[PDB]
Design a protein around this nucleic acid. Sequence first.
RNA 1: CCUGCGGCGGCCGCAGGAAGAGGAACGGAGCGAGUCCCCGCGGCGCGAUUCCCUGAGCUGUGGGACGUGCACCCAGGACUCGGCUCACACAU
Lengths: 128, 128, 339, 357, 94, 89, 313, 64, 62
Amino acid sequence: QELLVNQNPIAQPLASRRLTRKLYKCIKKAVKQKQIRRGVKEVQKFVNKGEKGIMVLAGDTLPIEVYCHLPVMCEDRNLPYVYIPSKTDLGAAAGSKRPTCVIMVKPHEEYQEAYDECLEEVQSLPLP
Amino acid sequence: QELLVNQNPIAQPLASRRLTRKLYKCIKKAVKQKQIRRGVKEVQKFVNKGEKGIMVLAGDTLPIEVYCHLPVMCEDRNLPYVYIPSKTDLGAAAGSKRPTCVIMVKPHEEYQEAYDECLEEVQSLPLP
Amino acid sequence: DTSQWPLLLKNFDKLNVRTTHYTPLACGSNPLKREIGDYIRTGFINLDKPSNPSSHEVVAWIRRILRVEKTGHSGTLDPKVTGCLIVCIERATRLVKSQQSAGKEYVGIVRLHNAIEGGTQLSRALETLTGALFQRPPRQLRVRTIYESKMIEYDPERRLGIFWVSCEAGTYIRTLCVHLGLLLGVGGQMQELRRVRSGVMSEKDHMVTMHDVLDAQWLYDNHKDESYLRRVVYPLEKLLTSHKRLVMKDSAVNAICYGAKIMLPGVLRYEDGIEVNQEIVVITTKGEAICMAIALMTTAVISTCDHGIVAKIKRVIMERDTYPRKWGLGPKASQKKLM
Amino acid sequence: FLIKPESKVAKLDTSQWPLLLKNFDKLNVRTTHYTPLACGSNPLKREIGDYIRTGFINLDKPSNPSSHEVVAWIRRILRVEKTGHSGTLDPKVTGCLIVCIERATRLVKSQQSAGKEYVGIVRLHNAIEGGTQLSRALETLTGALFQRPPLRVRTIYESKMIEYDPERRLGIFWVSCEAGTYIRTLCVHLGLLLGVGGQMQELRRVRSGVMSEKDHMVTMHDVLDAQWLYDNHKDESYLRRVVYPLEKLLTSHKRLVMKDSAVNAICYGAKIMLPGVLRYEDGIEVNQEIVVITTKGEAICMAIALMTTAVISTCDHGIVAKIKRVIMERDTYPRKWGLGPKASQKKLMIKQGLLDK
Amino acid sequence: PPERVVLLGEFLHPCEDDIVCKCTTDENKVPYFNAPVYLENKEQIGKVDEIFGQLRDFYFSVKLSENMKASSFKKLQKFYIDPYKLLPLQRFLP
Amino acid sequence: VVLLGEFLHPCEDDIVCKCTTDENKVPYFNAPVYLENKEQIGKVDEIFGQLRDFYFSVKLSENMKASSFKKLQKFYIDPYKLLPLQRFL
Amino acid sequence: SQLPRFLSGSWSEFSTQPENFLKGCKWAPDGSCILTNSADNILRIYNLEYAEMVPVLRMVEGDTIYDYCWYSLMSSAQPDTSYVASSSRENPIHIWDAFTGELRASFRAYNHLDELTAAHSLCFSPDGSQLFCGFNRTVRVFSTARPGRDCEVRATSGIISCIAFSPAQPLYACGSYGRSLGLYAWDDGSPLALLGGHQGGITHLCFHPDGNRFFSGARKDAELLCWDLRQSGYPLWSLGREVTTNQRIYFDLDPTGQFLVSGSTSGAVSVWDPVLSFLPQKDCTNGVSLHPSLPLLATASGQRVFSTRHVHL
Amino acid sequence: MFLQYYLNEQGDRVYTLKKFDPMGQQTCSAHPARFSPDDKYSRHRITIKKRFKVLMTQQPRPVL
Amino acid sequence: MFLQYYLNEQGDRVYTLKKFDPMGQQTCSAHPARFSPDDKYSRHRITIKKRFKVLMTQQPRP
RNA sequence: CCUGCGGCGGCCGCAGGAAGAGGAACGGAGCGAGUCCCCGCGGCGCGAUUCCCUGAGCUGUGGGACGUGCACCCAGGACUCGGCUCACACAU
C-alpha cells in the first residue's frame, strides 16, 4: 500500500488506488467554498438533525474510542462512508498541516458532477 | 457422462444412451390413450392386483424413503423395471412441466409392436 | 489413553484423589453393555419430526410401536414445523424438566408484503431486535431474551427472506416475524420453520426419523436381532456430560438409593470447580448414574475435613435394590452398638 | 470399563487454584476434626449482587478533570453507596487509580501509603552540554531529601532517564518513590542544580503498589458500556472483566486458616485463640502483618503476629494474633461461642484456674 | 375524557393503514392494552394494539378511529395518554 | 556570625551554596545572609539534595553583585538561625 | 360489423421474456384508458395512429395475480375515483392510485387461526360503497371507507371464482369451481336459488342491461349458457365455442345490449344477437373488450407452450 | 416447500433458496419424508437397503 | 501531548518522544480518550466492536 | 476492656459485644389425593367407472368429491395432606 501497513482493526471498507485521489480533488474543489465540515465536534452535531452529506474517515487513528460511534450514526439515517489510508494527507487536502480524523463533504453549489460521480460509486463497495 | 452425475446410490440398472429415447417415445405414444400410470399413490395400488405392466423410475429422487418399496414389490410378482436419468424429462415426456418419479406403461390398445420390443429387451439387463 | 473411555467416565484421570482402596462387587454393568430389556427402559431418541401431524401424536405412536407405558418430550412443536425433538422412555422421563428449559435455535422464512430497498434494510431491522423483548402470547404480556441473529439470503422478485435465531425456551418465532415487518414499514408473515438445536443434541449428529423407530422394532421381533436397534436408542448417561462428577464407592451405593445423604468417608474422587448450592451428578465406579444432588461443600473444604454431609439428594435414578445392603459395618457405627 | 482398586497413597496438586486457596496443601497442618457449614461463597463465583459490593477497579485516568470528580462519576454509574480512591492525582496527569467500591473501602488507608512509580517530561529554558549531563546529575538526587509543597522529608529509591532531544530542550525520566511525594517540585531542584531553570510539562503514573499497567488496565468508557450491557441484555459477562474481588490485593502476605465456628467471633471484638487454628504458613516472624482466612477462601481480617511458627507447632493454649483491621461483615456465619468443653465447665460456676487471659 | 394527559411519544413511518410510534414517556412506564390515545388538546384518535422492541426504548403502534388517515399526521408529532393507565417497569423485572 | 556555605555557581538571577557548617544544621525561611562584612547580600529561597550534605540557593536582596562572587567563596549567618538535624528524622 | 379496420397494436413490451402472455384487458368505465395484465405479474395502463403504443403507468406486484378491477364509478370528473384493485397469492388486497402509481390502501383478510388468506375474485358494489371478495367457501364484505382488517363474513360448495351484480334489482350471483351458480339477496345473505349447469369449472358471468337475461362460461366445457330470472327455469338456449385449456376466456356485450362477443382457443371471434367470425390473428384469443361510447374493440393474445395486443374498429 | 440445502467441506448444512450449487450439483429438500403409523412395507426397505451397503448398520460407528 | 510509545517483544510499553519506531511503524499516543459524563452512544460502540471481534469478552482470559 | 460508624496526630460522640472454637445420623425416600403454575372447520387407512384432477388453484415426494372405519387431547414442577409403603444408613 505504497508503505501503508499501520491500519486500525476497524477500517473496512477501504478506497481504491485512485478512488481516494478523486475524493481528494472533490474535497479541494469543495474547500473553495464554505461547503465542508471538520472535526468530530462538528460532524456529530450537524448529522444529528437533517444535514445530508458524505463522510470520509482516517484509517490510522489510535485510540479507536475517539470516533467509534460514527458508522452506526450513519447507518441509522442511511448515508455512505469510507476509510482513506492516512490522516497526514487528509489534513493537507483540507488546507491545514495539523492532521485530522474525519471530514464531511456535501452537495456543492454549482457543478455537482464529480460529487455525484463519487457518491453513486461509493454506494457499491463490498459489504464490510 | 452427459452432465448427470447426481444419481442416487440405489439406481441400478440404468438405461444407457438410446434405450431412454426409445422408452420416451413409447411413453408418449401411450399417453395419446388412457393407458398410463402416474404417481406413487397409483402405481402402488395398481400393481398389488394383477396389472401386467412395465415400470420406469427416476434416478435422482431424494430422500429415497419415498419409493424404496417398489422394486421388491416387483420381484415378488416378477415384473421388469428400470431407472432413467432425470425426472424433469420424465415429467416432460408425459406432457406436463412438473417432474415425477415413477411411471408405468402398459400393453397398448392398438397392440403396438414397439411395446413388445423393449419389454423383451430390458428383461436381459445385468442383475442389479 | 483416558480421552476415549465412554460417557461420564472420560478424562477421569484429571480429578483430585481422596482414597484408593475398596473391594469390588458383583452387581450392575456399564450402561453401554446394559441389557435390551432395560437399555430401552432407560433411554431417549433424537427424533426428526415429520410435517403434518401434531406432537402429542408422534409420541403416542412411539408408545404403541415399542411396547412401553410412559414418554415425555423436550419442547413442543406446532404441526407443520420440523426439526429436533427429544423423547424419553420410562425412567428418563424424570429428567424432563431440565430439557424443557434450555437453549434453542431455529431457521425461518418471511414474506414482505410490499417492496423495500435491498438486503440491508432487513439486516438492520434484525439487528435492532436482540436482548429482552416484549411478547404477547397468542394472558399477560411478558419478556424473553434473544442472543443472536443473522441474514442469510433475500430474494427480491418474490420478496422472501431467510434467517437464523438463537434464543430462549418459551419465545415465539411467529410473533417475531410480525414485528420485523411492522417496523420496516411494509408488513410480514411466517412461511416455514425448522428447529435445529435442543439442549446438547444438534441436528448435526445422532438423528433418525420415524421410519427407523418402526423398522428396528420389526427386525428385532422377527429375526431376534438387536444391532439395528441399539443404534436408534441411547442411554441416559449421554445427556448429562456437562454436569459435575462425584464418584462414590461400593457398599454406599445401595444406601443412597435407599435415601441416605452422602457422607465423606465413602467418596473416592471429586471434580475441580464445585460450588455451594449447585447440581452435581453422583456416579458409580462403572459409569452408572445414581442421582442428581445439590452440593454442600466447596471443592476445597472437601480437601480438609474428615466427615459430615456433602450433599442432599434432589432426585434419584437407580433401581431401589440393585446392589446389596452393606451398611452399619465399619470402624465406627459398629462401636456405637457396643453401648 | 472399570476403575481399579489400588493400595498406594493419594495426593493433590493444587498449584493453579484461584487467589488465596492456592498451594493450599503446603501449609503445615494442625488438626482436621471439625464441622464445616453452608454459608458464604468462593470469592470469584459470587452472584452479581455482592460481587460488586466488595470490589475494585484498576481505572486508567483521563486527562482533564480531578480525582474527586472521577470517583463521583463512577459512583453514579454503578448505583452504589460510597467510593474512595488510592491517592490523589492532579487534573493534568494520567495513570493508575485503584477505585475501591463500598467495602473494599476498609483498606484504603493501607493503599495510600504504598510505593509508586512515575514517568515524566522536564522542559529546560536554556541549553546544556547535553543529555549525558542530566544523566550524571539526576543520580545526585537518590535517597532521603527535603521538599515543601509548591518542610517535610521524603525518600526516593530509584530513578533513571531515558533519552534527550537538545533542540526543543525536553527530557524524559522514570522514577520510583515513596508515598505522598511531590513530583512537581523535583523538576525545580533539577533545574537549579542544572543551573538553567526547569519546569514540569508531562507526567504519568505507571504503578500504584501491586497493580501495574501491564495488568488488566481498563479505561473509563468501559465502566459505562458494561453497565449498560448488563442493563439491557441481562449479560453479566462484561461486568466481571472490569470489577475484581478485593481478595486480589491481599496476596503477598502470609496466611492463617481458621475454623468455621471461630469466625463470627473475630468479626466482633475478640482475640485469636490458639484452639481455632487449622493450618499456618511457615515463614512467619514476630510482630508482622498477616491475613486470616476461611476454609473457602474469603478473608476475615489482617492482624499482628505474636508467636513465630516454631512456637506455634508446640503449645497447650496461647494467643496467636490480635486484630488490626476487619474486612468481613458481621453476621455472615452464625455465632457459636457459648459452647464447648471448657466454656461449658466455666459457666457451670466452676473455676480451677487452669489459666486466664 | 381523562383529567390530564402525559407525553407518550413521537410519530414515524406508517404501515398498512396504521401508524408506528416511538415511546418516550418519563421513567419507562409501559401502557395498558387497548387504552385510548389522545391528541395534544384532548382529542381522541385511536387505541394501542401492539408493543415490541427492546426493554428500555420500545416502540408501539396505533389502531385509528374512523375519520383518520396515515397522511394527516406529520413527522415526530406528539400523542398523549391518560396517566392512570400506565404500569411501572418494576413488576416486569425479577 | 558563622560560616554558612560556599559559592558554587549562578543560575539566572541567583547563586548556589553548599551548607558547610560544623554540624549539619539547617536554617529558617528568609534569613538574611551576610559576609564577614556585616551586611545582607541576600537571603535563602530553598534547600535540596541529600539529607547528609545539601545545596541551597540564595536570592540577592538588592541589584548588588549580580556577578561579583568567585565560584567558591565564603558567606556567613548569625548563630541564632540554625536548628538540629535530629528534629527532621 | 364488416371486417373491422386494424388501427393499432402494442407487441413491444412483452418481448424481453422467454415466455409471456396476456390475461385480459379492460376499458375504464369512462373511456380514458385500458388496463392490461400479463404473465410476469405487472399491470399496465394505456391511453386512447401509425406507431407502437407505450403505456403511461406500470405496477409491479410480486408473485401472481388472481384478479383486478376498475373502481365502480371512475368518472375522471373528480380525481379521487382513480382506483384499481388487485389480489395475489400470499399478499392482501391492494388498492393502487391510477395517476402516479403509488399504493394508497390495503384490505387484509384473516383466518380462524390468525394466518392470512388470499382472495380469488373481487368486485365492487353498484353504488361503489362496498368490496366483495370470494374465498375457498365464503365471501368477505369490506366497506370502502375505513380500510384494514374488518370483515362481515357470509357462509355457504367450492372455491368461489367470480361475482357480478344485477343492473335493476337487489341481487347478486356467485360462480364456483364446484360447477354451480348461487343467487343471493344483496343485503341479508340468503340463497334465493341454486342452479346446476356446466361440465367444467365456471370462469365468468355477465348480465344484461334488461335485468332479466344472464350469461356464463366455463373452463373446459365447450359451450356457453344463457338463463333467465322472470322464469326460474333452466338454460333457455345454448351456444358453441371451443376451449381445450384451463383458462378464463372472456366475453362481453355492448352498452345497449344488441351484440355479444366471445373469445376462443384457436383465434377466431364469435358474434351473436349468429353473425360473423373475423379472425384476430393465429394464436389463442382470450380477453375481448368493448368501449362504452364509440364503436371500438380490444383483443389480447397468448397461451402456455409445453403474443400481441390489438385494437379494431 | 422452499427451503433447500447442501453440504459444506466440513460436512454441515448450508441453507439456501436456490435450485443448484456454486459448482452445479442439485440441492435436496430440508424437510423429511411423510410417515404413517401403519405401513406394511418394512421388509422391502431393509433388503434393498442392505443390497447396496447403506443401511444404518454398515456405516462406521460414532464416537460416544 | 507529546508522550508516545510502542510495544516490545514481551508486550510492555517503551516510551519515547519520536514519531516512528526503530523499524518504521507509527507510534500511538500515551494518554487515553477524553470523556464526558453524559455520553449517549454506548450501543453504537458495542455494536461495532462485536462485529470485528475486538470486544473484551471475546479475547483470551488472563 | 475490644471492634465498627461518624465529627474536628490526637481528642470527642454513638452503636455492637463480654468471646477457650461444640455434635461420626439429624431429620429422609418412593407412591396416592387436592389446589395453582406449565399449556374437535384437524390426524391415518379402505371401497367405488382407471372414483376425478398436471388448473390459469398449492399439489402427483399430492389435492378433491361420495360412502367408510380407526387413533388421539398428555407428561411435568410448586404448596398442602388432618394418607400408603420402605427406612431411620459416617460406607470396613
